[PDB]
Amino acid sequence: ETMIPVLTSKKASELPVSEVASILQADLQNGLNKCEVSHRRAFHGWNEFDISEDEPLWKKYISQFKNPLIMLLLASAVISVLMHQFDDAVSITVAILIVVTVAFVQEYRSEKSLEELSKLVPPECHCVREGKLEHTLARDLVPGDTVCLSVGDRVPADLRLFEAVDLSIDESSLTGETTPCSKVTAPQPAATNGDLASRSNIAFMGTLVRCGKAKGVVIGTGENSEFGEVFKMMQAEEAPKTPLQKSMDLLGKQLSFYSFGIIGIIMLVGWLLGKDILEMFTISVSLAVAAIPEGLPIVVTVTLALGVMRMVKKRAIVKKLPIVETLGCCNVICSDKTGTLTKNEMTVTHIFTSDGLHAEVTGVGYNQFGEVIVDGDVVHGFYNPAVSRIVEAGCVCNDAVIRNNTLMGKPTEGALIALAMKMGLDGLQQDYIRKAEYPFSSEQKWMAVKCVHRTQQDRPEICFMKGAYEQVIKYCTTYQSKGQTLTLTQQQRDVYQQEKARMGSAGLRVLALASGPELGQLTFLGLVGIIDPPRTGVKEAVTTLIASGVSIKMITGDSQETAVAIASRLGLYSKTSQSVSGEEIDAMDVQQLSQIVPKVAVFYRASPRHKMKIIKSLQKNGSVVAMTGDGVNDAVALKAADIGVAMGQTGTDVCKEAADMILVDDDFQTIMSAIEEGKGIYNNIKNFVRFQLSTSIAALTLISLATLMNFPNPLNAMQILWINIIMDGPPAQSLGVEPVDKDVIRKPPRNWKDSILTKNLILKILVSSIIIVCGTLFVFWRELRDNVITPRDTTMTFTCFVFFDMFNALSSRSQTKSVFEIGLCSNRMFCYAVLGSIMGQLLVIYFPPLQKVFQTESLSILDLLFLLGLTSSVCIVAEIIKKVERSREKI
Ligand code: BEF
Ligand SMILES: [Mg+2]
């Protein structure tokens, strides 16, 4: 009854077991009955929360339709419709349909790939009902149910523990702590209950039980657990607008202002001249319709879709095009540590024998991959007796079992199992029969077993112990040295202590091993260094990112020592750096955080709110901040961050949803490939924008000048259509599809205040436009001095304009490198397009049918050569400017 008010983990931790049971009306021994479970499920529902609420396809279509450039395109389409411009409206609607169709197809494919990659099995739960243990699905849980936890079990819901022996729960998923947290059934004081990791009497949903047996009572199901509050916070923060979208909006506003300026200028010119108002107004609106280019969205969408497809081919799914743009223009990259920077898989890396030999173990994870190297020599099997004895002691005295690269047991024991597997001694456990077992406990801090060989049962009993050095060395009396048994002296003990301290100073966890006939007279074997190593290929990637001008910071909820060791190993920590805890982050506000966070680089013991605050503080300075992670605090960080990078294997569903790209193989080379692709996309967009703006400005100026005085429209409809095809067609697409240069990807990241339209680009556009219009006006001046209108004037102007457009496109192929630096062939599509256009022009000016259709005349070889030479000043001037800029650069 009482509708079963949900108890938070805080209050459940504060109140004792009896009070919680009385409040929840839960039977600890006999469990719940079916009728009560159904009654409680009728209100609280199932143990699920809605993830990725997907709207129908029409909503996504409308969302892709909603773009300021698209709105400008429809505005231009309707204003052309009111003046009976059918061709312009058809072109605009075709461009809009193509852009939205491509965007919808790409997003649908990305969503399908995300759904297929993330395969989820319905988890089960062990609970007692009516007094007999029966296995239910995790969804059927209701508050008050008594849940039994075993080794390897995944916690389905929040539990108030009342029975637990030697329980160890891996909370790296929720808190990021690599070391499993011991659980105690005693109530916790309110003073020490502030932190999540300090709640040792609460079992959190989604965590993995690594050791011990537990019995708890459900206190929260669904969105009321600790995995529901983080989800609520996730759907409470607005992702910030991408710099690509801001640049697109700024460019659209600039284009609208430019169109308004030109129509006002034409209005003023017409008023000054004395022409009629209505025809001049119609001409102004027609010129405005001719402005606002329509191919920019097509080119941008095509280039970004090609980049997305390339990223997919590189094992990386991208939800949005501005997402990959944000990754390309990233400035600061942050990282969770436990999970994306480290394998979250304890592995033995250093072995020290009783004889003094040092052994290095390579490889990461719970897999047989890896080799043990002693003095530059690979050791396999029983090659080295000293290392082999340690491996045998760690393998026989082991209860952890790894199946299909999944560890069931203590991570430290899994490290020893993996080390034994790397040496080819995986089956050493089956060769002995464990007669007497002493289990590992916090008080004793050691574990010893007694066993006899399967086929050598007549051999005397041998006992192996593992644990802390201090406890193991008490039962050790002799040591082995080069196959000889010598009594353990005080000097040897001091040497072992020195080695243990040296290994601990490097962040390695020291475990002692021994073997002998009976407890107390064991022989010391050696020490093994167990650490949680970083993922392969991460140190080089971090070094490359640091050398590229991108700062790398670490935010994690683990201990200070582990974070410091990991950062020092990866190069993010030194002897002069500083570390800031979560309490220090919560201490100051705004200004002091802004002074502190950029200087520091290591954050330890950080709550999800602390990570969100750090992300917001980094965003306040204006730098683009990136973060990668696999947890829930990481998920809320990616939600607060502009760019979200997740892991497709070790990550969670919440982390994957909160992110914006998912990594399949858990690599960073893919991340810098995305950065390079984004830089190339930005360069191509800049070049295409410059070329199209210059061409549009020149064409509009020429049309306005022609209409202004006397001769009305000295060009036929077919010539105008072919001109419109050339500038905004295959040449434009080929310019927008320009590949990635090897020099544009070795540059410092673009600043936040940098925009596409710069003063240099504007000056180059103006210079090219004035040169083109001067050449065309000189040609038309010679033809008007001829004082005859016999299609020769029209065809000469048509060819001059076509050649000027081609040379402008060739000049705008690159903005930094010269013409003879990227290759004449380069894009095969560009060569095909220019060859097709030039043969079409030759047929138009040569074939009598096409000549009559286009109203052209015959041109001799000398005239064609002179035209080719004259319409080359744009390319020559642009190359001279580029060469001057290049000189001065280095100079
Ligand atoms: F998984 Be991270 F260390 F928060
Ligand atoms: Mg993590």
PDB file of C-alpha atoms in Angstrom, residues 673-847:
ATOM      1  CA  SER A 673      41.169  11.150 -39.873  1.00  0.00           C
ATOM      2  CA  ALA A 674      37.851  12.864 -39.133  1.00  0.00           C
ATOM      3  CA  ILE A 675      39.757  16.035 -38.214  1.00  0.00           C
ATOM      4  CA  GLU A 676      41.636  15.950 -41.528  1.00  0.00           C
ATOM      5  CA  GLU A 677      38.414  15.266 -43.447  1.00  0.00           C
ATOM      6  CA  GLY A 678      36.714  18.207 -41.741  1.00  0.00           C
ATOM      7  CA  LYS A 679      39.639  20.495 -42.549  1.00  0.00           C
ATOM      8  CA  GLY A 680      39.515  19.411 -46.190  1.00  0.00           C
ATOM      9  CA  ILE A 681      35.743  19.914 -46.296  1.00  0.00           C
ATOM     10  CA  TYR A 682      36.148  23.422 -44.871  1.00  0.00           C
ATOM     11  CA  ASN A 683      38.843  24.242 -47.438  1.00  0.00           C
ATOM     12  CA  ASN A 684      36.665  22.972 -50.297  1.00  0.00           C
ATOM     13  CA  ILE A 685      33.677  24.953 -49.001  1.00  0.00           C
ATOM     14  CA  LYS A 686      35.806  28.104 -48.787  1.00  0.00           C
ATOM     15  CA  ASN A 687      37.133  27.661 -52.332  1.00  0.00           C
ATOM     16  CA  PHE A 688      33.685  26.949 -53.788  1.00  0.00           C
ATOM     17  CA  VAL A 689      32.147  29.904 -51.933  1.00  0.00           C
ATOM     18  CA  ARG A 690      34.870  32.234 -53.214  1.00  0.00           C
ATOM     19  CA  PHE A 691      34.516  31.032 -56.810  1.00  0.00           C
ATOM     20  CA  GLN A 692      30.713  31.167 -56.823  1.00  0.00           C
ATOM     21  CA  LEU A 693      30.627  34.607 -55.187  1.00  0.00           C
ATOM     22  CA  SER A 694      33.125  35.992 -57.707  1.00  0.00           C
ATOM     23  CA  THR A 695      31.232  34.497 -60.655  1.00  0.00           C
ATOM     24  CA  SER A 696      27.861  35.752 -59.391  1.00  0.00           C
ATOM     25  CA  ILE A 697      29.219  39.246 -58.705  1.00  0.00           C
ATOM     26  CA  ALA A 698      30.798  39.482 -62.162  1.00  0.00           C
ATOM     27  CA  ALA A 699      27.671  38.190 -63.917  1.00  0.00           C
ATOM     28  CA  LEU A 700      25.346  40.504 -61.978  1.00  0.00           C
ATOM     29  CA  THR A 701      27.574  43.521 -62.630  1.00  0.00           C
ATOM     30  CA  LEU A 702      27.738  42.722 -66.351  1.00  0.00           C
ATOM     31  CA  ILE A 703      23.966  42.221 -66.605  1.00  0.00           C
ATOM     32  CA  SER A 704      23.256  45.445 -64.699  1.00  0.00           C
ATOM     33  CA  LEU A 705      25.673  47.412 -66.891  1.00  0.00           C
ATOM     34  CA  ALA A 706      24.183  45.953 -70.084  1.00  0.00           C
ATOM     35  CA  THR A 707      20.598  46.677 -69.015  1.00  0.00           C
ATOM     36  CA  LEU A 708      21.520  50.147 -67.731  1.00  0.00           C
ATOM     37  CA  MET A 709      22.398  51.746 -71.086  1.00  0.00           C
ATOM     38  CA  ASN A 710      20.772  51.337 -74.506  1.00  0.00           C
ATOM     39  CA  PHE A 711      21.261  47.706 -75.609  1.00  0.00           C
ATOM     40  CA  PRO A 712      18.706  45.549 -73.751  1.00  0.00           C
ATOM     41  CA  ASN A 713      19.970  42.007 -73.041  1.00  0.00           C
ATOM     42  CA  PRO A 714      22.472  41.410 -75.902  1.00  0.00           C
ATOM     43  CA  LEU A 715      22.337  37.630 -75.413  1.00  0.00           C
ATOM     44  CA  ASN A 716      19.888  34.941 -76.499  1.00  0.00           C
ATOM     45  CA  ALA A 717      17.909  32.683 -74.174  1.00  0.00           C
ATOM     46  CA  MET A 718      19.925  29.595 -75.136  1.00  0.00           C
ATOM     47  CA  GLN A 719      23.204  31.392 -74.401  1.00  0.00           C
ATOM     48  CA  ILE A 720      21.879  32.512 -71.005  1.00  0.00           C
ATOM     49  CA  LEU A 721      20.762  28.960 -70.197  1.00  0.00           C
ATOM     50  CA  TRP A 722      24.139  27.499 -71.179  1.00  0.00           C
ATOM     51  CA  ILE A 723      25.943  30.158 -69.123  1.00  0.00           C
ATOM     52  CA  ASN A 724      23.771  29.345 -66.103  1.00  0.00           C
ATOM     53  CA  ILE A 725      24.527  25.645 -66.602  1.00  0.00           C
ATOM     54  CA  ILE A 726      28.297  26.198 -66.709  1.00  0.00           C
ATOM     55  CA  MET A 727      28.747  28.331 -63.585  1.00  0.00           C
ATOM     56  CA  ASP A 728      26.302  26.514 -61.283  1.00  0.00           C
ATOM     57  CA  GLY A 729      26.741  23.005 -62.685  1.00  0.00           C
ATOM     58  CA  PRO A 730      29.355  20.276 -63.108  1.00  0.00           C
ATOM     59  CA  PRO A 731      32.254  22.754 -62.740  1.00  0.00           C
ATOM     60  CA  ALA A 732      30.789  23.904 -59.417  1.00  0.00           C
ATOM     61  CA  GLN A 733      30.299  20.328 -58.205  1.00  0.00           C
ATOM     62  CA  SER A 734      33.841  19.372 -59.253  1.00  0.00           C
ATOM     63  CA  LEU A 735      35.252  22.402 -57.432  1.00  0.00           C
ATOM     64  CA  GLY A 736      33.239  21.453 -54.342  1.00  0.00           C
ATOM     65  CA  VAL A 737      34.469  17.844 -54.538  1.00  0.00           C
ATOM     66  CA  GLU A 738      38.144  18.875 -54.357  1.00  0.00           C
ATOM     67  CA  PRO A 739      40.197  16.286 -52.402  1.00  0.00           C
ATOM     68  CA  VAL A 740      42.141  16.803 -49.174  1.00  0.00           C
ATOM     69  CA  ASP A 741      45.549  18.459 -49.440  1.00  0.00           C
ATOM     70  CA  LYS A 742      48.558  17.217 -47.481  1.00  0.00           C
ATOM     71  CA  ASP A 743      49.408  20.727 -46.218  1.00  0.00           C
ATOM     72  CA  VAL A 744      45.969  21.967 -45.101  1.00  0.00           C
ATOM     73  CA  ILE A 745      45.744  19.178 -42.491  1.00  0.00           C
ATOM     74  CA  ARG A 746      49.053  20.096 -40.797  1.00  0.00           C
ATOM     75  CA  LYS A 747      47.816  23.509 -39.616  1.00  0.00           C
ATOM     76  CA  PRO A 748      46.791  24.768 -36.158  1.00  0.00           C
ATOM     77  CA  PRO A 749      43.052  24.527 -35.440  1.00  0.00           C
ATOM     78  CA  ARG A 750      40.837  27.304 -36.751  1.00  0.00           C
ATOM     79  CA  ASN A 751      39.948  30.019 -34.254  1.00  0.00           C
ATOM     80  CA  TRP A 752      36.376  30.480 -33.055  1.00  0.00           C
ATOM     81  CA  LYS A 753      36.094  34.027 -34.445  1.00  0.00           C
ATOM     82  CA  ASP A 754      37.362  32.995 -37.899  1.00  0.00           C
ATOM     83  CA  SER A 755      34.700  33.104 -40.624  1.00  0.00           C
ATOM     84  CA  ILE A 756      34.500  31.903 -44.220  1.00  0.00           C
ATOM     85  CA  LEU A 757      34.246  35.423 -45.675  1.00  0.00           C
ATOM     86  CA  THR A 758      37.567  37.120 -44.891  1.00  0.00           C
ATOM     87  CA  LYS A 759      39.127  40.304 -46.246  1.00  0.00           C
ATOM     88  CA  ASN A 760      41.630  38.431 -48.440  1.00  0.00           C
ATOM     89  CA  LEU A 761      38.880  36.313 -50.011  1.00  0.00           C
ATOM     90  CA  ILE A 762      36.740  39.408 -50.614  1.00  0.00           C
ATOM     91  CA  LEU A 763      39.681  41.237 -52.207  1.00  0.00           C
ATOM     92  CA  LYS A 764      40.473  38.270 -54.467  1.00  0.00           C
ATOM     93  CA  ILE A 765      36.807  37.965 -55.474  1.00  0.00           C
ATOM     94  CA  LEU A 766      36.647  41.679 -56.289  1.00  0.00           C
ATOM     95  CA  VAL A 767      39.886  41.578 -58.296  1.00  0.00           C
ATOM     96  CA  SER A 768      38.719  38.579 -60.328  1.00  0.00           C
ATOM     97  CA  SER A 769      35.298  40.148 -60.923  1.00  0.00           C
ATOM     98  CA  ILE A 770      36.721  43.475 -62.116  1.00  0.00           C
ATOM     99  CA  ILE A 771      39.228  41.713 -64.383  1.00  0.00           C
ATOM    100  CA  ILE A 772      36.506  39.532 -65.926  1.00  0.00           C
ATOM    101  CA  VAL A 773      34.110  42.435 -66.456  1.00  0.00           C
ATOM    102  CA  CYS A 774      36.915  44.587 -67.891  1.00  0.00           C
ATOM    103  CA  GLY A 775      37.800  41.891 -70.419  1.00  0.00           C
ATOM    104  CA  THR A 776      34.169  41.337 -71.390  1.00  0.00           C
ATOM    105  CA  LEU A 777      33.511  45.090 -71.638  1.00  0.00           C
ATOM    106  CA  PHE A 778      36.590  45.535 -73.840  1.00  0.00           C
ATOM    107  CA  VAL A 779      35.394  42.744 -76.148  1.00  0.00           C
ATOM    108  CA  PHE A 780      31.920  44.281 -76.321  1.00  0.00           C
ATOM    109  CA  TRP A 781      33.519  47.691 -76.924  1.00  0.00           C
ATOM    110  CA  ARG A 782      35.447  46.358 -79.921  1.00  0.00           C
ATOM    111  CA  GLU A 783      32.245  44.754 -81.212  1.00  0.00           C
ATOM    112  CA  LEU A 784      30.246  47.981 -80.765  1.00  0.00           C
ATOM    113  CA  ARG A 785      33.021  49.908 -82.519  1.00  0.00           C
ATOM    114  CA  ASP A 786      32.464  47.435 -85.351  1.00  0.00           C
ATOM    115  CA  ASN A 787      28.946  48.963 -85.271  1.00  0.00           C
ATOM    116  CA  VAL A 788      27.341  45.764 -86.616  1.00  0.00           C
ATOM    117  CA  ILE A 789      25.066  43.299 -84.805  1.00  0.00           C
ATOM    118  CA  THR A 790      25.421  40.016 -86.724  1.00  0.00           C
ATOM    119  CA  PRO A 791      25.469  37.271 -84.034  1.00  0.00           C
ATOM    120  CA  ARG A 792      29.287  37.634 -84.020  1.00  0.00           C
ATOM    121  CA  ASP A 793      29.026  40.005 -81.052  1.00  0.00           C
ATOM    122  CA  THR A 794      26.795  37.567 -79.163  1.00  0.00           C
ATOM    123  CA  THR A 795      28.996  34.533 -79.810  1.00  0.00           C
ATOM    124  CA  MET A 796      32.189  36.442 -78.955  1.00  0.00           C
ATOM    125  CA  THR A 797      30.665  37.576 -75.656  1.00  0.00           C
ATOM    126  CA  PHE A 798      29.407  34.038 -74.964  1.00  0.00           C
ATOM    127  CA  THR A 799      32.823  32.462 -75.562  1.00  0.00           C
ATOM    128  CA  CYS A 800      34.617  35.193 -73.590  1.00  0.00           C
ATOM    129  CA  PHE A 801      32.312  34.663 -70.607  1.00  0.00           C
ATOM    130  CA  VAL A 802      32.663  30.869 -70.793  1.00  0.00           C
ATOM    131  CA  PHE A 803      36.464  31.073 -70.936  1.00  0.00           C
ATOM    132  CA  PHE A 804      36.534  33.606 -68.088  1.00  0.00           C
ATOM    133  CA  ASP A 805      34.407  31.277 -65.952  1.00  0.00           C
ATOM    134  CA  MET A 806      36.665  28.312 -66.750  1.00  0.00           C
ATOM    135  CA  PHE A 807      39.823  30.248 -65.884  1.00  0.00           C
ATOM    136  CA  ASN A 808      38.252  31.568 -62.671  1.00  0.00           C
ATOM    137  CA  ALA A 809      37.358  28.001 -61.673  1.00  0.00           C
ATOM    138  CA  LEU A 810      40.897  26.833 -62.464  1.00  0.00           C
ATOM    139  CA  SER A 811      42.308  29.684 -60.363  1.00  0.00           C
ATOM    140  CA  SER A 812      39.927  28.894 -57.484  1.00  0.00           C
ATOM    141  CA  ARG A 813      40.827  25.189 -57.593  1.00  0.00           C
ATOM    142  CA  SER A 814      43.266  26.058 -54.787  1.00  0.00           C
ATOM    143  CA  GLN A 815      43.735  29.091 -52.546  1.00  0.00           C
ATOM    144  CA  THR A 816      47.257  28.483 -51.178  1.00  0.00           C
ATOM    145  CA  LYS A 817      49.084  26.152 -53.570  1.00  0.00           C
ATOM    146  CA  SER A 818      49.884  27.275 -57.103  1.00  0.00           C
ATOM    147  CA  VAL A 819      48.452  25.794 -60.299  1.00  0.00           C
ATOM    148  CA  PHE A 820      51.515  23.593 -60.881  1.00  0.00           C
ATOM    149  CA  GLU A 821      51.554  22.165 -57.343  1.00  0.00           C
ATOM    150  CA  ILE A 822      48.469  19.896 -57.101  1.00  0.00           C
ATOM    151  CA  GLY A 823      48.518  18.213 -60.522  1.00  0.00           C
ATOM    152  CA  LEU A 824      46.810  19.136 -63.787  1.00  0.00           C
ATOM    153  CA  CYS A 825      44.718  15.942 -63.810  1.00  0.00           C
ATOM    154  CA  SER A 826      43.714  16.047 -60.123  1.00  0.00           C
ATOM    155  CA  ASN A 827      39.955  15.504 -60.340  1.00  0.00           C
ATOM    156  CA  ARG A 828      38.916  13.226 -63.197  1.00  0.00           C
ATOM    157  CA  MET A 829      35.346  14.527 -62.899  1.00  0.00           C
ATOM    158  CA  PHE A 830      36.573  18.108 -63.362  1.00  0.00           C
ATOM    159  CA  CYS A 831      38.523  17.122 -66.484  1.00  0.00           C
ATOM    160  CA  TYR A 832      35.504  15.270 -67.883  1.00  0.00           C
ATOM    161  CA  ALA A 833      33.229  18.248 -67.199  1.00  0.00           C
ATOM    162  CA  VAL A 834      35.559  20.797 -68.790  1.00  0.00           C
ATOM    163  CA  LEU A 835      36.160  18.559 -71.826  1.00  0.00           C
ATOM    164  CA  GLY A 836      32.425  18.050 -72.292  1.00  0.00           C
ATOM    165  CA  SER A 837      31.672  21.753 -71.928  1.00  0.00           C
ATOM    166  CA  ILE A 838      34.440  22.749 -74.345  1.00  0.00           C
ATOM    167  CA  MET A 839      33.293  20.219 -76.960  1.00  0.00           C
ATOM    168  CA  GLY A 840      29.722  21.460 -76.536  1.00  0.00           C
ATOM    169  CA  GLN A 841      30.923  25.026 -77.078  1.00  0.00           C
ATOM    170  CA  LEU A 842      32.874  23.931 -80.163  1.00  0.00           C
ATOM    171  CA  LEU A 843      29.781  22.194 -81.554  1.00  0.00           C
ATOM    172  CA  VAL A 844      27.602  25.231 -80.778  1.00  0.00           C
ATOM    173  CA  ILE A 845      29.943  27.664 -82.558  1.00  0.00           C
ATOM    174  CA  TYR A 846      30.795  25.206 -85.370  1.00  0.00           C
ATOM    175  CA  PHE A 847      27.807  22.991 -86.231  1.00  0.00           C
TER     176      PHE A 847
END
